[PDB]
């Protein structure tokens, strides 16, 4: 049944740096602040 028929991609942490620098900008942190302050109201949802 094989004969009929017939994620470890290396990612370097140095090459991501541009994206990390995007997160040091106070625009994106203004945004994460708004985001996290909207989610900080007490949730009654649980699972």
């Amino acid at each position: 049944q094989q004969d009929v028929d017939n994620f470890i991609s290396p990612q370097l942490p140095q090459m991501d740096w541009r994206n990390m620098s995007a997160r040091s900008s106070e625009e994106s942190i203004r945004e994460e602040m708004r985001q996290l302050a909207e989610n900080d109201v007490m949730q009654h949802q649980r699972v």
């Binding site: 740096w17 541009r18 620098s21 040091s24």
Partner: protein, 257 residues
């Protein structure tokens, strides 16, 4: 600070192995050394057998002194040392150029760019300050130009781990602030002298470093940059290189056939 002597001794043993990039020549620039030496693959150049710094027989700082190692140098080590030296004295030199608080004359064009980017000069002052102030290590903080997003964002502030150069990321260095702990220390003992928490004094070093900057130098730097990414030979070289990379993909894909 000045490594010119140790590098004067080290360089001739590097240059024959750098002939790939360019061969033996009179004047070499620390920048081009830094980039030629920057990323070293374990695969191509390993530590040669009986590597004197591998078995901890000789220290990396003293490999410049003994001549036995200079005859038959271990490429990755020699490289690492040279990279470090060239980078650090590139830093000191650069800082001695930006660190002239001499002329309080501030260019109009610089303001013109900075307000478009940040929205004021105080905004940039504050960017530099919080980037130099809050650091994971005591390094140097750089203000540089990146051609990538350059239409949108001309400038950004990267604080580099230790003495590592921004040229290594393909960024064009404009200015630099020295937060290395020698500065912090002599600052501390400059305060107890006359005629306290670390955080606030290293931020005081940050924003008394920013006030001592010479903006004209940054004008020349930025203009040089823009001119460079505007050059034809830049485009041409890019084309020729990517052409080579394509030929290589093709021939390596044909090799298995």
């Amino acid at each position: 600070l000045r490594n010119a002597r140790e590098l004067h001794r080290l360089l001739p043993a590097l240059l024959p192995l750098l002939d790939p990039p360019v061969p033996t020549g009179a004047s070499v620039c620390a920048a081009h050394l830094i980039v030629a030496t920057g990323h070293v693959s374990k695969q191509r150049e390993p530590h040669m057998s009986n590597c004197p710094v591998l078995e901890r027989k000789i220290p990396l700082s003293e490999i410049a002194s003994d001549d036995n190692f200079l005859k038959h140098p271990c490429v990755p080590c020699l490289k690492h040392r040279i990279n470090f030296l060239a980078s650090e004295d590139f830093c000191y030199d650069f800082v001695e150029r930006c660190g002239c608080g001499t002329d309080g004359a501030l260019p109009p064009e610089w303001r013109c760019i900075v307000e478009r980017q940040f929205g004021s000069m105080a905004a940039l002052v504050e960017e530099l300050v919080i980037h130099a102030s809050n650091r994971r290590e005591a390094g140097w903080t750089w203000l540089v130009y990146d051609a990538q997003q350059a239409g949108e964002r001309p400038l950004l502030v990267v604080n580099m781990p230790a003495q590592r150069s921004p040229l290594l990321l393909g960024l064009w260095p404009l200015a630099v602030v020295n937060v290395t702990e020698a500065v912090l220390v002599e600052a501390v003992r400059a305060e107890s002298s006359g005629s306290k928490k670390l955080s606030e004094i290293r931020e005081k070093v940050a924003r008394d470093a920013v006030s001592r900057m010479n903006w004209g130098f940054i004008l020349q730097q930025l203009k040089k940059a823009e001119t460079y990414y505007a050059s034809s030979d830049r485009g041409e070289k890019i084309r020729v290189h990517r052409m080579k990379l394509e030929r290589e993909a093709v021939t390596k894909a044909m090799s298995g056939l």
